[PDB]
Every structure is written in structure tokens, then in C-alpha cells.
Structure 1
Amino acid sequence: SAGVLVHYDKPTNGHHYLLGTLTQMVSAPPYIINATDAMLLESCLEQFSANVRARPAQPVTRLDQCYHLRWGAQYVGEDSLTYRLGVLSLLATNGYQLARPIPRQLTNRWLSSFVSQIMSDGVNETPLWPQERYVQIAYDSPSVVDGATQYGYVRKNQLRLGMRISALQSLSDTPSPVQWLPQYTIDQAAMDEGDLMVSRLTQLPLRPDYGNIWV
């Protein structure tokens, strides 16, 4: 019932079976978090951070930096944060990078906001679905962890992900808006749909400063 998810990449003192305790932390506004979820979240964030600063000749602490649930599967549901976190852990293993710009250290407030966005419910774009039969490895994934793994890890030869490999440079924030070059497309649509879409996204209405026509 406590359930077991572990980083199989290194046994600190040997294989260790983590079990979730009764204690859970809701200290982060406003979500309530089980110990299992908190550990998974930190490990997952660390893995994503590793992908962000990935260096070709730079060594990693563990090729496997994600806890994977070995036991407690009957107590585990897809809708649960833990299940999505496992999908995210698999994505981190594949090296997946978050579209939103990532700070070197996510703020506690930033971490909470990230949790809130994860809380936003949507179709999961990644097609990975968990198997306790074995850890699933993509055939074309960039990292060598599958070669490193000796037990419990399986790479599907038919499993190939069609995504390019790219890591961006410094992405600091910008104070004021700037022009974006716009190009139109041949597709045509009803004016009414556009009006309704504008009403959904309109910032109207408010009072701006007039300024001076002549000086």
C-alpha cells in the first residue's frame, strides 16, 4: 500500500525498496502531497534540469534519475499525479525538455505554479503508457541508459519517437513586448467564428493615456 518506486541506476547501499508512509505534505499552497509524490517530483525536476544543461562530454550522477513504481501498482491510478509524474520521469529519461523556460532552480512559488499547470488536465501528448512488465525504452532515444541498464529495463525496437534533438541557450525574461513578423495562410474561415474567438481572448476594454498629438 506504501508502494515502491526507485532509481534502479545506482543502489546507494544496494537495492532499496521505498515505501510511502502515512505522513504527506500539503505545505505547498495549495496542493496536498503524499511523500511518494514529493520525492518523485524532486527527482523528476532534477532529471529535467539535467536535460536542460546536458553537455555531450559531461558525466551524469545517474543515467537513471527517476523513481519507477515496482510495487503498489494496484494502489496506483492513471489520473493520479504519481502516474503523470511517472510519464514525466520516462520523458526525462528520453531527455524531454519542458516548453516553458526552466530556471536553474525552480522557485518554491515557481514549483507551485508548475504543479498548478501539471494540475491543468489535458490529453497527454507523449504516447508512453506504463508497463510493470518492464521499464520501457524508446528505440531511438539519445541517452545510453538502456545499454547501462542490466535488469528490469526494456527498449522497444519498434518504439521510435519522431522528435528532433535541440537544447537552447540562456532564456532570461523580457520587460516589454516586441513586434512578431506575421505571415498569412491560404485557409479561409467564417468572420463570426473569428469574432467569437476574439471575445474569448479580448483584452477590451480599458483607458490608455492619450499622449500628445503635437509638440
Structure 2
Amino acid sequence: SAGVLVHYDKPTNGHHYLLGTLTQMVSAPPYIINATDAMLLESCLEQFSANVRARPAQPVTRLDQCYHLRWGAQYVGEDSLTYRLGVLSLLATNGYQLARPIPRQLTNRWLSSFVSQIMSDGVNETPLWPQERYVQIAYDSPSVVDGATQYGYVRKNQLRL
């Protein structure tokens, strides 16, 4: 009923799944967050920071840091926090960058504002759509997981940015 998460790039001790418990995070002043939403949010922020700070000669521990949702999509609505965080995770993995600085030590109020922006009214313009089946990469995206990694990533010649 809660989602199931996975890393495809370099999981810590081998292939594994993460299942979230039904606790919540109330530290954010105006918003309540389930555990699975909190994990997706922290990882996507990490990958955005790593994208912006990237340098061609500077290696990184992992090329992808965002989580992927593998099970339990049918329990999540399109107005919800989990679905939008999944879309944002896919965007960050593709190489997208937020148009606003991310501080090197996050605070509660900043996270509150960020979540409020995520749940603000509007629609999604980018042509990237979530699928629990696999992780889809654009034709011309500057990622390099596909050559080094064999499982979980598929590159589409017709999905281009």
C-alpha cells in the first residue's frame, strides 16, 4: 500500500528494495510528509545539487542519486505529493536544474516553501512521464548511466529535449 523504492545505479550492499512505514514528518511547519515522500524529496534535492555543482574532471560517488518508485502507484493520486515528487525525480535524473539556489545547509522554512511551490497550482510542461516499469532517459540527455549500467535504464531515440 505504501510504495517500494529502489536504486539501480550502485545500491549500497547489493540489490534491494525499501518499503516505507506509515509514520510521518511534522517538522515542516505547514506540511505533513509520509516517510516515502520524505525519502524521495531528500534524494531529489541531492541530485539537483549534484547536477548544478558538476565538473567534467571531478568524479562523484554515484552518477544517479534519485529514488525510483517500483510498486504502489495505484494508491497515489495525481494531486498528491508522491506523484509530483516522482516526476521531479525523473526530471532531475534527466539533467534538469532548478532556477533557484539550494543552500548547503537546509532549514525547515526553506523546505516548507519548496513543498508549497511543488504543490502550487499549475500543470507539468516537460515531456517526461513516470512509469514503474523502467527509468526512461531522453535521446540527447547529458547523462552517462546507460553505458556503465545495465539494469533499469532505457534510452529512447524519440523522447528528446
CA gap 1:95/1:106 in 2 versus in 1, 3 angstroms: farther
* 1:156 to partner: Cα distance: 0.7
Structure 2 contact 70–133 (Cα < 8 Å) conserved:
no
Give the distance between the partners of 2:97 and 2:20, measured in 1 at CA: 28
Question: If the length of structure 2 is used for normalisation, what is the TM-score?
Answer: 0.92
How far apart in 2 are the matches of 1:14 and 1:5? 14
- Rounded Cα–Cα distance in structure 2 between residues aligned with 1:94 and 1:110: 24
TM-score by length of 1: 0.70
Q: Secondary structure at the match of 1:93?
A: helix
How far does residue 90 in structure 1 lie from its aligned partner after superposition?
Answer: 1.1
Q: Counterpart in 2 of 1:129?
A: 129
Give the corresponding residue for 1:49.
Answer: 49
Cα gap change, 1:77 to 1:60, in 2 (>3 Å):
farther
CA positional deviation for 1:100 = 2.1
Shift of residue 10, structure 1, vs aligned partner: 1.3
Deviations 1:109-166 (A, max 9, x none): 1121111111212111222111223211111000101223311211111111xxxxxx
Q: Tell me what 2:89 maps to.
A: 89
What displacement does 1:86 show? Answer: 1.2
Q: In the TM superposition, what whole-angstrom CA distance separates every residue of 1:65-100 from its partner, at most 9, and x where no partner exists?
A: 111111112223322211111111111112211112
Structure 1 segment 66-105 matched on structure 2, within 5 A = 66-105=66-105
DSSP-derived class of the 1:11 partner: coil
The secondary structure found in structure 2 opposite 1:136 is strand
C-alpha separation in 1, matches of 2:125 and 2:106: 23
Structure 2 gap ranges (5+): none
Q: Aligned-pair distance for 1:102? A: 2.8
**Using CA pairs below 8 Å that are at least 6 residues apart, which structure has the higher relative contact order?**
2
Q: Is the CA contact (8 Å cut-off) linking 1:3 and 1:70 kept in structure 2?
A: yes
- Helix, strand or coil for the counterpart of 2:19? coil
TM-aligned CA deviation for residue 56 of structure 1? 0.9
Q: CA deviation at 1:106?
A: 3.4
Percent of aligned pairs with the same amino acid: 99
Cα 1:33–1:155 change in 2 (3 A) is same
Q: Distance in 2 between matches of 1:132 and 1:56?
A: 31
- In the alignment, the residues of structure 2 paired with residue 11 and residue 114 of structure 1 have an alpha-carbon distance, to the nearest angstrom, of 28
Residues 6, 66 of structure 1: 8 Å contact kept: no
* Contact 2:27-2:108 within 8 A present in 1 as well: no
Matched pairs, number? 161
Aligned partner of residue 69 in structure 2, secondary structure: strand
For residues 107 and 52 of structure 2, the distance between their equivalents in structure 1, rounded to whole angstroms, comes to: 16
**What is the match of residue 4 of structure 1?**
4
Q: Give me the whole-angstrom Cα distance separating, in 2, the residues matched to 1:35 and 1:51.
A: 24
CA distance in 2, matches of 1:2, 1:48: 25
Q: For 1:117 and 1:73, how far apart are their aligned partners in 2?
A: 23
Question: 1:47: how far off?
Answer: 0.3
Give me the whole-angstrom Cα distance separating, in 2, the residues matched to 1:105 and 1:115: 17
